[PDB]
Design a protein around this ligand. Structure first.
Ligand SMILES: CO/N=C(\C(=O)N[C@@H]1C(=O)N2C(C(=O)O)=C(CSc3nc(=O)c(=O)[nH]n3C)CS[C@H]12)c1csc(N)n1
Length: 265
């Protein structure tokens, strides 16, 4: 049925596809390799912002953090323009979500403190939401480079979709803080050609992307039908058959999204 098209898309692009849509009151759950482990990549930056907000009052957003050029390890379109001025935590939240800024994600992890530069505290945050499967061990850019089969810095479409459901649709955050997280994801600038490109234009899409080596390309989203019904969609992919230098395929994540839309309609 639907698993034959996902398995078909896997064949067309030479990839491994993981899909999960948590069931609503009227629609059942969509699952394709939903419980297989995939690599977080940049998708952790969205629930990471929720950890910082959950721990501190809104006044913490105005605290300024200064850094040096030696701290810039990865793609950081915004952090590279502020080495002399510094950035406040709120701006680091903005950069980490809407621009996938890697340095801003590393600084926010250090704000969580603790061993591993904050990775153990971040894993602790996911456990508080009920996720006992996911784990973050390294920072940018090392967390995108773990070999296949290595369970470090991994999650599942099942686990990540339910985490995002609580932050956007649930009560994981108070309403004022919940408003800040959704707005940033709503004005994200990196996902134009993935889940957004698969749904019709009159469906609202907010998302956070992820990309790494071994052809890894992820997108996590909450979408709204024209009538206003919300759905959470997790799509993850890798192409380990082509090794470290595998080229990611954004078209695979658009096709899979369209398949999901034809079922939810
Ligand atoms: C939703 O994204 N769509 C985009 C897009 O990527 N736009 C960006 C976005 O959100 N932008 C923002 C900002 O962060 O506010 C800005 C702010 S840029 C900026 N403001 C400052 O105050 C400053 O000191 N320095 N800089 C550089 C404008 S473009 C961009 C787009 C590009 S072409 C097109 N048709 N759409």
């Amino acid at each position: 049925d639907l698993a034959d098209r996902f398995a078909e898309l896997e064949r067309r692009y030479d990839a491994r596809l993981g899909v999960y849509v948590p069931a609503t009151g009227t629609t059942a759950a969509i699952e394709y390799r939903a419980d297989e482990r995939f690599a977080f990549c940049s998708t952790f930056k969205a629930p990471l912002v929720a950890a910082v907000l959950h721990q501190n009052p809104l006044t913490h957003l105005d605290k300024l953090i200064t850094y040096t050029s030696d701290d810039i390890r990865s793609i950081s379109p915004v952090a590279q323009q502020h080495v002399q001025t510094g950035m406040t935590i709120g701006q680091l939240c903005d950069a980490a979500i809407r621009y996938s800024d890697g340095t801003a994600a590393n600084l926010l992890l250090a704000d969580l403190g603790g061993p591993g530069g904050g990775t153990a505290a971040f894993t602790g945050y996911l456990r508080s939401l009920g996720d006992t499967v996911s784990r973050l061990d390294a920072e940018e850019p090392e967390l995108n480079r773990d070999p296949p089969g290595d369970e470090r810095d991994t999650t599942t479409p099942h686990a990540i979709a339910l985490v995002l459901q609580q932050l956007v649709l649930g009560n994981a955050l108070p309403p004022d803080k919940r408003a800040l997280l959704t707005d940033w994801m709503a004005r994200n600038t990196t996902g134009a050609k993935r889940i957004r490109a698969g749904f019709p234009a009159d469906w609202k899409v907010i998302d956070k992307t992820g990309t790494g080596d071994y052809g890894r390309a992820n997108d996590i989203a909450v979408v709204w039908s024209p009538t206003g019904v919300p759905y959470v969609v997790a799509v993850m992919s890798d192409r380990a058959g082509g090794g470290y230098d595998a080229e990611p395929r954004e078209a695979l994540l658009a096709e899979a999204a369209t398949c999901v839309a034809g079922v939810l309609a």
